[PDB]
UniProtKB/Swiss-Prot annotation:
Gene3D superfamilies: 3.30.230.10, 3.30.70.240, Elongation Factor G (Translational Gtpase), domain 3, P-loop containing nucleotide triphosphate hydrolases, Translation factors. Keywords: Antibiotic resistance, GTP-binding, Nucleotide-binding, Protein biosynthesis, Transposable element. PANTHER family: RIBOSOME-RELEASING FACTOR 2, MITOCHONDRIAL (PTHR43261:SF1), TRANSLATION ELONGATION FACTOR G-RELATED (PTHR43261). Residues 1-241 form the tr-type G domain. Abolishes the inhibitory effect of tetracyclin on protein synthesis by a non-covalent modification of the ribosomes. GTP binds at residues 9-16, 73-77, 127-130. GO terms for biological process: response to antibiotic; ribosome disassembly; translation. CDD domains: Tet_C (cd03711), Tet_II (cd03690), Tet_III (cd16258), Tet_like_IV (cd01684), TetM_like (cd04168). This is Tetracycline resistance protein TetM from transposon TnFO1. It comes from Enterococcus faecalis. Belongs to the TRAFAC class translation factor GTPase superfamily. Classic translation factor GTPase family. TetM/TetO subfamily. InterPro entries: EF-G-like_DII, EFG_II, EFG_III/V, EFG_V-like, G_TR_CS, P-loop_NTPase, Ribosomal_Su5_D2-typ_SF, Ribsml_uS5_D2-typ_fold_subgr.
Amino acid sequence: KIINIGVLAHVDAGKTTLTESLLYNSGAITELGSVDKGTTRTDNTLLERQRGITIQTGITSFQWENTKVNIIDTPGHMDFLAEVYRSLSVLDGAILLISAKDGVQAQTRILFHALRKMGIPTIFFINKIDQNGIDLSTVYQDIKEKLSAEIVIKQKVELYPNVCVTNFTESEQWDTVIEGNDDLLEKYMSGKSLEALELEQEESIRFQNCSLFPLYHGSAKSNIGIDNLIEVITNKFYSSTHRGPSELCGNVFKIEYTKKRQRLAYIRLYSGVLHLRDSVRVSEKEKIKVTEMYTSINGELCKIDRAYSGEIVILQNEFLKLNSVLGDTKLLPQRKKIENPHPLLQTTVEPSKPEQREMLLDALLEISDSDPLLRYYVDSTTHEIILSFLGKVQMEVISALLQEKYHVEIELKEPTVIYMERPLKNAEYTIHIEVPPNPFWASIGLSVSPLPLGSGMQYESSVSLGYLNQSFQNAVMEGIRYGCEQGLYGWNVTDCKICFKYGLYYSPVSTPADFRMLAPIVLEQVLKKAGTELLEPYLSFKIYAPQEYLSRAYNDAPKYCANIVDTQLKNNEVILSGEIPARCIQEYRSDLTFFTNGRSVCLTELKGYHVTTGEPVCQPRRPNSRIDKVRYMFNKIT
Ligand SMILES: Nc1nc2c(ncn2[C@@H]2O[C@H](COP(=O)(O)OP(=O)(O)CP(=O)(O)O)[C@@H](O)[C@H]2O)c(=O)[nH]1
């Protein structure tokens, strides 16, 4: 046989997981008919279990006295989207979900979209919760607009309430639809109709191509029609290669470890095996057996075979996620398409109490590994490395898991704006003469000149030209950037310059490293006149939102510390691409989605300091060291 890589998406609470566990029982019965739960083996991760929902993409694989296959169970809601995308970035076809009230959810839309551009050969809906107020007319109306998929055929309905019965039919309509696809069919349709078998092939070819697609309906709760559905889903949906017998080609699948008893690993074969050594980036694989996934639980395997498909319950270190198993066939599988899951919003993560720091450091490593997008990045202002999560939703769960394994507890907000304090206005002071230091005359002088916006100016020479004060202007740049940021208000040198000369030496006095100390001192005095330029935070924060919400979106933007620029309506939607200060990203992002329900989207940086418009109430954070320079400064102030 073969199988077929299929995932399961859709909004929250719409049966995604249960429907999954279902396909397991339906296509099996090797000792189970429904298996209690409530909770089971599919979602074995604590919390995921004790919690209720699956915050991590599952990974199932059922089979029958005919064939088998795997699966990937994504999580609903947001925040976790970044772990849902990773699953989708493998899987060819997506079993879209849709519960009763789930009348065209927010994710029911998107899943289907990605797949349409990726190549997903077929995407399949499954209305769940046909309990009450479960029309049939409503399902199709929603479908046709959203999924915008090609007008398929029917049917799948009959009876009402307790009298509800499974049905479908609609041959003529199907013929008509298929007609669009083939000229030959139309002619026959106009005069004849042909057969069904061949028409079934036309549809099946179109589904693997990423064009045609059919949807089956069959309730869910009472899980009746469940068992036919499972048969029918597996039917048209497998692979190729296999047939022959040779070469193993695969794509190391994710599946990170845990705390309790280390972890495992899984890869998919599409015409390969499992054993021997290995290859790829000079490195030995090391194996002690082949692989062979299994329904219930997954255990080692003696042997497998070519064109074999399953999961390997192993793999650990000396490797990593997304790993290409060299080779021959893996490079081609990389011609499907990506989705730069773009993680937009983010927050500040801070270690915590001393006791909590030991665990923190280890935590930050483990949370990063169990994530393919856990960009662990460290800031300069603090020795703490902020977390990179498409949202806190991930970060809640991330402190919950940790609270067990390693054990820790930190905070989750965003951070600081460096301050910059690169105002404009203008000022100039200098140059010393000698004192608590020891002239050491070195006159000095800095002609501060605000400027316009977007030039980072800087400078400058001065001078005399004779090595001296050369590397000295070096010391310059130094102390420069130095307070440039760290300082009174802790800014980041940006928009200013300087220049001077002198003087005295050829014996002693100490006119070397001392200059570096002096430089800062001079800048400080100019502070009183500086002000403490916030800077200018905005970018363009540019909001992509629907034509209907954008008016009210624009009234809310001025209240929300944002500016607006015009917004042209592009089709059914709009873009309302504007500027503003900088964030709060969170503030910016919340409101948009809020009065939009769930049908917002946005991103974009921009850069630029020109701003400062933020008053004060703060402006601080440093500083530095270096006896000399430091001793000198303190005296100077006196
Ligand atoms: N009435 C009804 N309720 C159902 C049906 N299927 C599932 N549910 C309800 O939903 C609960 C859990 O749903 P689940 O499958 O985990 O939802 P989900 O799609 O995984 C949502 P997420 O993955 O985002 O956590 C069940 O315990 C049950 O009460 C159904 O067909 N009809």
